[PDB]
Design a protein around this ligand. Sequence first.
Ligand SMILES: Cc1cc2nc3c(=O)[nH]c(=O)nc-3n(C[C@H](O)[C@H](O)[C@H](O)COP(=O)(O)OP(=O)(O)OC[C@H]3O[C@@H](n4cnc5c(N)ncnc54)[C@H](O)[C@@H]3O)c2cc1C
Ligand SMILES: Cc1cc2nc3c(=O)[nH]c(=O)nc-3n(C[C@H](O)[C@H](O)[C@H](O)COP(=O)(O)OP(=O)(O)OC[C@H]3O[C@@H](n4cnc5c(N)ncnc54)[C@H](O)[C@@H]3O)c2cc1C
Ligand SMILES: NC(=O)c1ccc[n+]([C@@H]2O[C@H](COP(=O)([O-])OP(=O)(O)OC[C@H]3O[C@@H](n4cnc5c(N)ncnc54)[C@H](OP(=O)(O)O)[C@@H]3O)[C@@H](O)[C@H]2O)c1
Ligand SMILES: NC(=O)c1ccc[n+]([C@@H]2O[C@H](COP(=O)([O-])OP(=O)(O)OC[C@H]3O[C@@H](n4cnc5c(N)ncnc54)[C@H](OP(=O)(O)O)[C@@H]3O)[C@@H](O)[C@H]2O)c1
Lengths: 442, 444
Amino acid sequence: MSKVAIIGAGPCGLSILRAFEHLEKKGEKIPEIVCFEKQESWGGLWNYNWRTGSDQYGDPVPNSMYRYLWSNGPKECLEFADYSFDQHFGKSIPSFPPREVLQDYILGRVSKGNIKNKIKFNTRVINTVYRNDKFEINYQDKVNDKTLSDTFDYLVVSTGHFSVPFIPEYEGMSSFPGRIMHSHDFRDAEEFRGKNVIVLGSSYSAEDVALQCNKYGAKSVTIGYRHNPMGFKWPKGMKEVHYLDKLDGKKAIFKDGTEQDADVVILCTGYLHHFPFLDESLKLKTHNRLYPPKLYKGVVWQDNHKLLYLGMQDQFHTFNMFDCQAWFARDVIMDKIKMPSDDEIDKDINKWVSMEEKLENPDQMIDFQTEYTKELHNISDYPKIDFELIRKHFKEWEHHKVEDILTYRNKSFSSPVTGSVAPVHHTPWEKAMDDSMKTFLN
Amino acid sequence: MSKVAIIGAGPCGLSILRAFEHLEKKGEKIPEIVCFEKQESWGGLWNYNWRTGSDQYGDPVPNSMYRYLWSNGPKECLEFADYSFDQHFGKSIPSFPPREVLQDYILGRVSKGNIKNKIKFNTRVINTVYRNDKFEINYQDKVNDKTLSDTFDYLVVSTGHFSVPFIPEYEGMSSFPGRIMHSHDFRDAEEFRGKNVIVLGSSYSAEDVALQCNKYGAKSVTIGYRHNPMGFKWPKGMKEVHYLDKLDGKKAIFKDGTEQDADVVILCTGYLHHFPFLDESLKLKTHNRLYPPKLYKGVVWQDNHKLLYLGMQDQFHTFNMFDCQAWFARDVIMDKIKMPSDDEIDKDINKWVSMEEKLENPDQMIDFQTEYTKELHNISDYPKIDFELIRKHFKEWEHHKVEDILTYRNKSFSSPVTGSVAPVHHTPWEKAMDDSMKTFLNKR
Ligand SMILES: Cc1cc2nc3c(=O)[nH]c(=O)nc-3n(C[C@H](O)[C@H](O)[C@H](O)COP(=O)(O)OP(=O)(O)OC[C@H]3O[C@@H](n4cnc5c(N)ncnc54)[C@H](O)[C@@H]3O)c2cc1C
Ligand SMILES: Cc1cc2nc3c(=O)[nH]c(=O)nc-3n(C[C@H](O)[C@H](O)[C@H](O)COP(=O)(O)OP(=O)(O)OC[C@H]3O[C@@H](n4cnc5c(N)ncnc54)[C@H](O)[C@@H]3O)c2cc1C
Ligand SMILES: NC(=O)c1ccc[n+]([C@@H]2O[C@H](COP(=O)([O-])OP(=O)(O)OC[C@H]3O[C@@H](n4cnc5c(N)ncnc54)[C@H](OP(=O)(O)O)[C@@H]3O)[C@@H](O)[C@H]2O)c1
Ligand SMILES: NC(=O)c1ccc[n+]([C@@H]2O[C@H](COP(=O)([O-])OP(=O)(O)OC[C@H]3O[C@@H](n4cnc5c(N)ncnc54)[C@H](OP(=O)(O)O)[C@@H]3O)[C@@H](O)[C@H]2O)c1
């Protein structure tokens, strides 16, 4: 009988819409659900958008993906337990597909029934307060430039945390005669063909943006790290150096003495958990980490058990972890799962946070998020999927990356849902310029 | 005894802080004033910021000015009546200085006294409602990431309207392999040296951005217009054509049949009046125009006479019009100027709006904004300044631009405050590659 708001129709919002759909299909009555989405269409980060900065309505652009982007982990690690790759595609396909292929898969799962009709597009949630046992939500109908309001019993926040960039300043940027941008702004690597590119950062964005520039003909790529290098086997014309000190004209100078001609600086410096549309008392405040506190089972706002956050953890797992979170959230909303006492909640959060703080390397992190996801899996009815196989896959993938960062996407993994073995793509990633769905689907 | 909030410490917010400072210096008691500014420092659009999009706190970047920017109208048309160029600089200087020079002038006026201490920097107003005769305002202390609240008797909105870009979509952008950006994003024109550039738009940004790209070495510049061309005398490597039809891979295709290989598309397509931090009932909704309705004397919100907007009109005049608006607003706050009846207010708004809709060319627009500003001038005590001279200067300047768009910045105008004649600069603008104040003010 309740009313539920969902903010965002990317993978997470769709996961929970899908979780509710399972119940509705079985004949169970479900709450009225309204999902708000500021983009024109569903899909979240998996939508390519040429736009950067803010849109025609003055709304910041949430899209961060670029042209000719390929998935960066094995698809077998992100398969939906309730909607297999074999089911969607009708055949085995390689393990590292281009963006549009995974976009098609994500949207395919939810596009058969009534889910899309529940979403309000070009609609931006702007204000949320909890009063008289209800979430009072203001939202902007962007197309009409009008503020609307509604009230809800439960609120699910699924707005991601890789859209609002963190952008640090370095000395000399005020006079640098070239482009300075964040990875959030990166759209087509052809922009930088023939250019000397500087990339700052040491995680997924720095890695892939650097490789993307090199693949699309950058004259040179120089990666600066603050703490430790990624240490991958970079191809000729790429190097990793310690700590940008300053830009001095067309020259980047690093603390280790390196001086490099620079045409463009791409800050691959991460993102903010940013929730301007939530009251302070409701607002998760955290850096990117595997287990932020104040979230029971990584989902329920400790302070308000009718506020549920999805996908706010840093990510090895993605799609099927979001699913496990969403099935859990659904069952909480439906009162199938009961909240334990405040003391038990606090104890459980501390247990996981304590483990998280002690993680020292990717193997331990993969193990950590495996156990986190498996525990969620066991408390609801999300279907069978082999998280132990996924655990092994992630570790194998990490090894591939150290062995050869240029060829890890040329590897085959097996489905943890169907056992199907992925073929090796007809074209090595380094030479794969045709990222079309047709070619991928041979 | 009242408490006054001002949003923004750009030229307009500084104008009203300065207007109040005049009274305080004379010995008059003035209200408590709090000015909120999202930037790290004062100056508004006159601050150069390498940042684009949004900042390290997730706050959209309000800066739109680029490297190599020079005054686009005669400085004599924007002189402060109460702080002359002669006073600030101690000598006559050319009429079209680079950004840093005019920034220095703006901040010079307000930097001698207690104004800076009234401003909270890296502070963003986020919510405003009017309740029980007060504006309840929430603002974000960005450095601490904390929401604070306060209440005020009057609210002055001076957040400009050239910060939040209007960015239209054209067919084929989703598959374009080059850069697509708005003029709001434009920073260093050297970025486009040796590139083919497309500029869309027909106003000041399109004009100046196209010129900067050419000046700093673009392989070509092609300007697309929707309605009519600017029609200026463009130099070699530049052309003006009708209406972008689509991007087809790298190729820009126009409705007049032109096809141009493109490396970058720069949308010089204007900006939004954007006030997400104001309640719907308080929010001005308008496109860029010389006289938006619902603003008595172009300043007082028709529906709430304690809400005052500055600088929201499209601009020939800038600084001294902002001043005349601010002096007016100050006097309204101080109860020196009384509001007329509702009917009188409505009639006066209709009178100006009706005149505004009938304007057909820049001469008429210049005359209109001259009369608007002169009427403001006459109802308060902003010092003597010759708006009739400014009227003539603007018309002369429009002529210079048609004559030769490359050399209008080389011309000389006289001060409407002191009469001083500007010397011709030591470097013609078309050759002036260095935009530093140091280089400008010093011997060649
Ligand atoms: C460049 C990049 C590449 C990546 N590549 C991979 C990959 O190869 N494999 C992988 O598994 N993962 C990848 N990811 C990770 C990504 O986080 C997940 O794949 C997934 O997109 C997370 O989904 P989400 O729903 O939680 O958030 P999102 O996909 O970001 O969805 C959030 C949605 O909320 C909307 N929203 C935000 N604020 C509001 C508001 N106020 N009102 C209404 N709507 C709002 C946004 O428009 C967006 O649609 C990548 C991430 C990035 C940034
Ligand atoms: C590219 C460009 C070139 C120009 N060149 C010229 C020129 O050569 N000559 C000329 O006369 N005019 C020029 N202008 C015109 C310009 O509008 C005026 O000179 C002047 O800057 C307007 O000042 P303002 O105070 O109204 O607004 P702004 O200068 O924009 O100041 C507004 C301030 O409000 C702040 N702000 C906004 N929102 C918030 C919030 N929510 N909370 C707190 N603070 C906020 C912003 O940070 C900014 O500091 C130019 C404009 C542009 C865009
Ligand atoms: N499909 C793909 O190929 C692809 C491509 C892009 C990104 N992604 C996704 O993007 C998401 C986020 O990855 P991310 O790399 O953007 O964020 P991230 O994992 O949070 O990493 C942020 C990086 O910024 C660095 N950093 C922080 N402050 C800095 C500073 N002041 N100067 C320089 N560096 C600074 C950090 O290292 P230090 O603190 O040591 O400096 C860190 O390496 C991931 O989910 C990933 O999957 C995937
Ligand atoms: N100091 C300097 O040299 C300098 C440099 C740049 C800017 N500025 C200042 O910046 C301020 C704003 O000027 P502006 O030119 O940015 O804004 P503007 O005056 O509002 O002009 C907006 C332009 O966008 C065009 N347009 C609108 N929709 C469009 C679409 N869908 N496609 C293509 N074009 C579209 C309009 O023409 P159509 O409607 O006919 O298409 C118009 O020419 C001015 O105050 C100016 O002084 C100064």
